[PDB]
């Protein structure tokens, strides 16, 4: 066998960040990656037509200080996603341009309902500990309800319910009826709340990496050299002996003191364990699916939308639209003009049956309608990736928790199993689901091992992160009226 | 590589039934079984204290003609579970003995609510095709709510809601908020409806096999000889070449024309596929967990409950009770007196923290109160099995579907993937979740392959089963009043219309 200090299973950002930390501390690490590439749910494609394009995870923003620091160390730079001009909300067949992060409404009743919806998401979040959502005071009540049930209760207008539904679909690539309310509320809260998670300027979608996010994993692979083994899917982990034994599908055996599992939780099912996993993890990893998304990028000769004072962001309500959300994917120089759109949740399943060319046509026709421009019908290039197809991801962006699961099994996610510690963005406590969470979790799991080895104290397992100088966070603010305007039923109680 | 016609992955009842059918048709079959035993979610323990005991699947009954026929052919016999004396419904700390399958109520409003609850489960079920539940007219609406939501809408009394909750917990070893309403309604309907699924006499729990259900898989192994390979967990299936290659964990390669996957759907995740699975199956197998149950058998010197005119059946509502349901597990000879109980759904997780001895004590204390009998505190022996611990089962009894999954992914459950065909009880259309469904699916999958090989016509893939002459099925009937008594809101509507 091939002997080392730590085997890291998975060469996504999380596994790479863990391996780098352990390597930098002087341990001999091996990364076993199932695919013929690193990066996992990040994947940057290069060709002459696009130069580069992120087909997986791409955006970073303020408060994501760990991914920003790691990337900066590896020599990467960011640029801002274009949000100079107006955003579009397309509702009942018409485009309504706006500025600011939240799509506005004019009807007084609908205004109260929208205001109350967003406010309530954050109010509920304040009672959910980031590191232990199952300790929320109403954890059981909220976990035993889907987001569809919660929205049906909260939203007195169809307007609010449709936007709230889009919000859920876009955040977690899942239907409102598929996901626990507790989990979804936790998910938003642990990204810093509604404003932070939905915002381009001053939020999660503010920036992209120049040259693609795949460079994070690639450049850590560059550092580690032949310590990264590609096309080594892990099939078997044996902890019965002195050293942990890790076997791959291509018949290699690795021997280590400890293991980091840096794969999506459910993909633990692809590994046969000796001894068997404890009951709760055994069942947990069958209860935690990933979402469904096709990421689609349509290229144009110019960013023609900008001429009409549109930035390229479209929020598109309703069943008919294949894509509910877009961002300008143009490169910082104004070249490789492009619109990125997501085909979300059930639509990813439905539209997957079409050809690439058929999806292109549907997207272009949608964009022509929403941007009010025939230029949208003249694409120069198209790239897409359906993440539902991936054996070694299970979906994207991340794992969702159906009703009842987080309270019953949530504690299990990062609980060590003998000498196996658990990384992966799903185990993070801040921006779980994102590249930021991947770094947090990888580095925390690495430091758990350093602590197990007696190399650092307990209090250094979790480490704060200085704020990025390049991408500082501005405060999230609310107005007096936003804080104090009644809900619809609140207004009815007064009458 | 070890060459054959068909590799069957999994040596449970379904895989063994498939392998037997293929073997009997003259093909060369291999069964690759992960464990050191066959039977899977069936497991018959033998020792001197119990003689034999089913720790997994046990009960068979009328309308389950495939398992009955298979078992009979293998030389097995059944006996009736004891239901001579009164059943007990224990509610709010008190026991109420009764007869008939449904726990009764006296309060007229509660009576209407209970009657409407069961009726409505079956009314909704009649809308749902057994072979295509996603084709129900309101499939999407029903699949997008949990059973909790449905019961909250349907049950106008807490009495009905509590019993309905126990019904779901006991039927599918999952919480009402965990499971799709469409899927649960399908599940009940495809067992023949509420009466059939809940009944001992004339239903699913009528009988057990003399000597244990494990004998079904064991006796098929005896017929197959060395074709069954134990401690061969399958890790890899490669369909890129002319013949399918199937690799095991212990470093063996098998080569076949076709493969039958006879494992729980989610346990397909334990196999690496080349080429990758199609998208819909890739995601489906991460969305279909199994339920949670500890099966617990407490042994006594005598079946003392019978002397108080209790048959041993206890239906126990609420949170505090560790066990919500019991049956008499005494041998047909009248010895090895025993009570079988299930610890269900979240309680299987909660009470797994305890020792075996602590669980025995809590069960005995519960039974002593429910039976009003100090003798329940004097057990002579105890056996149990927590199926949540099993790497190669994932849980018991079966796979449940959370909201939204059956409509989006249900159609690919038994869709072949090139030369892989899908057996397992989960793919059955009649008594899916049960030993019966395991037989149906194994035999159907086997015949799919026979058809692919040009050995039988397409109309022979699905085959009806003659009714058992030993376990005849009484029809499910309703009374006029059961059919036409109003629901609680129906009564309220009548009240508003009268006074107008
Ligand atoms: C897919 C996606 C993701 C995404 C998103 C849009 C799409 C379409 N947008 C994002 C965004 O704009 N900003 C952001 O910060 N995140 C976004 N996401 C999510 C993001 O990509 C993920 O959160 C992150 O990449 C997850 O990283 P992590 O390291 O936790 O996980 P991973 O990338 O899945 O890596 C796991 C690796 O393990 C390998 N693997 C799997 N099984 C095995 C076995 N058995 N043996 C060995 N290796 C295994 C995988 O191949 C993978 O490389
Ligand atoms: C567990 C349980 C089940 C049960 C029940 C009570 C409990 C506690 N009560 C039942 C009852 O009274 N009556 C009844 O008819 N059914 C009852 N159930 C359900 C019943 O046991 C199951 O429906 C049935 O046994 C399932 O049969 P099936 O053949 O479909 O599935 P299986 O038994 O799980 O067999 C699968 C086999 O495959 C092996 N395996 C798993 N993974 C692999 C890999 N990778 N490679 C090779 N083999 C694999 C398993 O080890 C198993 O043997
Ligand atoms: C009206 N809707 C919003 C449909 C329900 C109110 C919910 S509730 O009355 O606040 O429970
Ligand atoms: C008057 C309110 C009573 C609510 C009773 N429950 C059973 C809670 C709901 C009835 C739902 S439905 O109204 O029949 O659709
Ligand atoms: O909720 C979001 N944006 C948003 C932006 C405007 C309106 C509404 Cl309702 C939602 C976002 C949620 O998570 C994401 C994850 C990856 C990429 C983009 C987003 C996103 O824009
Ligand atoms: O629903 C059931 N029984 C029942 C019996 C009486 C009252 C009520 Cl509410 C329920 C049962 C359903 O599925 C089963 C599966 C394996 C073993 C027993 C049962 C069962 O008794």
Curated annotation (Swiss-Prot), chain A:
Effect upon mutating residue 296 to S: No loss of activity
Gene Ontology terms describing biological process: dopamine catabolic process; hydrogen peroxide biosynthetic process; substantia nigra development
Phenotype for residue 171 to S: No loss of activity
Keyword vocabulary terms for this entry: Acetylation, FAD, Flavoprotein, Membrane, Mitochondrion, Mitochondrion outer membrane, Oxidoreductase, Transmembrane, Transmembrane helix
First-listed, main subcellular location of the protein, grouped into a coarse class: mitochondrion
Annotated positions of the N6-acetyllysine modification: 51
InterPro entries: Amino_oxidase, FAD/NAD-bd_sf, Flavin_amine_oxidase, Flavin_MAO
Assembly description: Monomer, homo- or heterodimer (containing two subunits of similar size). Each subunit contains a covalently bound flavin. Enzymatically active as monomer.
Protein name, as recorded: Amine oxidase [flavin-containing] B
Taxonomic lineage: Eukaryota, Metazoa, Chordata, Craniata, Vertebrata
Curated annotation (Swiss-Prot), chain B:
Subcellular location: Mitochondrion outer membrane
Function: Catalyzes the oxidative deamination of primary and some secondary amines such as neurotransmitters, and exogenous amines including the tertiary amine, neurotoxin 1-methyl-4-phenyl-1,2,3,6-tetrahydropyridine (MPTP), with concomitant reduction of oxygen to hydrogen peroxide and participates in the metabolism of neuroactive and vasoactive amines in the central nervous system and peripheral tissues. Preferentially degrades benzylamine and phenylethylamine.
Lineage: Eukaryota, Metazoa, Chordata, Craniata, Vertebrata
Effect on the protein upon substituting residue 381 to R: Significant loss of activity
Swiss-Prot/TrEMBL keywords: Acetylation, FAD, Flavoprotein, Membrane, Mitochondrion, Mitochondrion outer membrane, Oxidoreductase, Transmembrane, Transmembrane helix
Name listed for the protein in its UniProt record: Amine oxidase [flavin-containing] B
Cofactor(s) needed for function: FAD
Site (Important for catalytic activity): 155, 364, 381
């Amino acid at each position: 066998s091939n002997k080392c200090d730590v085997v890291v299973v998975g060469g996504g950002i999380s596994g790479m960040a863990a391996a780098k930390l352990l390597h930098d501390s002087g341990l001999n690490v091996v990364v076993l990656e199932a695919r013929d590439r690193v990066g996992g749910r990040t994947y940057t494609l290069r060709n002459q037509k696009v130069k580069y394009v992120d087909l997986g995870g791409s955006y970073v923003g303020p408060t994501q200080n760990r991914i920003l620091r790691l990337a900066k160390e590896l020599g990467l730079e960011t640029y801002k996603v274009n949000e100079v001009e107006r955003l579009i909300h397309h509702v009942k067949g018409k485009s309504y341009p706006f500025r600011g992060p939240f799509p506005p409404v004019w009807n007084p009743i609908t205004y109260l309902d929208h205001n109350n919806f967003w406010r309530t998401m954050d109010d509920m979040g304040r009672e959910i500990p980031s590191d232990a959502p199952w300790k929320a005071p109403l954890a059981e009540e909220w976990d035993n309800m889907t987001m569809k049930e919660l929205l049906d209760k909260l939203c007195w207008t169809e307007s609010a319910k449709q936007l709230a539904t889009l919000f859920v679909n876009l955040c977690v690539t899942a239907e409102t009826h598929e996901v626990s309310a507790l989990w979804f509320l936790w998910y938003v809260k642990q990204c810093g709340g509604t404003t932070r998670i939905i915002s381009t300027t001053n939020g999660g979608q503010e920036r992209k990496f120049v040259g693609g996010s795949g460079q994070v994993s690639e450049r850590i692979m560059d550092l580690l050299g032949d310590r990264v083994k590609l096309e080594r899917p892990v099939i078997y982990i044996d902890q019965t002996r002195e050293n942990v034994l890790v076997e791959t599908l291509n018949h290699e055996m690795y021997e280590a003191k400890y293991v980091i599992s840096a794969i999506p939780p459910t993909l633990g099912m692809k590994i046969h364990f000796n001894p068997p996993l404890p009951m709760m993890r055994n069942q947990m990893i069958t209860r935690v699916p990933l979402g469904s998304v096709i990421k689609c990028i349509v290229y144009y000769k110019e960013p023609f939308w900008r001429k009409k004072d549109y930035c390229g962001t479209m929020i598109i309500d309703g069943e008919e639209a294949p894509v509910a959300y877009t961002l300008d994917d143009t490169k910082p120089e104004g070249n490789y003009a492009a619109i990125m759109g997501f085909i979300l949740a059930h639509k990813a399943r439905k539209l997957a049956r079409l050809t690439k060319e058929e999806r292109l046509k549907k997207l272009c026709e949608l964009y022509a309608k929403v941007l009010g421009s025939l230029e949208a019908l003249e694409p120069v290039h198209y790239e897409e990736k359906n993440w539902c197809e991936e054996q070694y991801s299970g979906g994207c962006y991340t794992t969702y928790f159906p009703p009842g699961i987080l309270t019953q099994y949530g504690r299990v996610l990062r609980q060590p199993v003998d000498r196996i510690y658990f990384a992966g963005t799903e185990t993070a406590t801040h921006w779980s689901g994102y590249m930021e969470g991947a770094v947090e979790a990888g580095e925390r799991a690495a430091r758990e091992i350093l602590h197990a080895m007696g190399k650092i104290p307990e209090d250094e397992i979790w480490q704060s992160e200085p704020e990025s100088v390049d991408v500082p966070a501005q405060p999230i603010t609310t107005t007096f009226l936003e804080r104090h305007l009644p809900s619809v039923p609140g207004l009815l109680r007064l009458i």
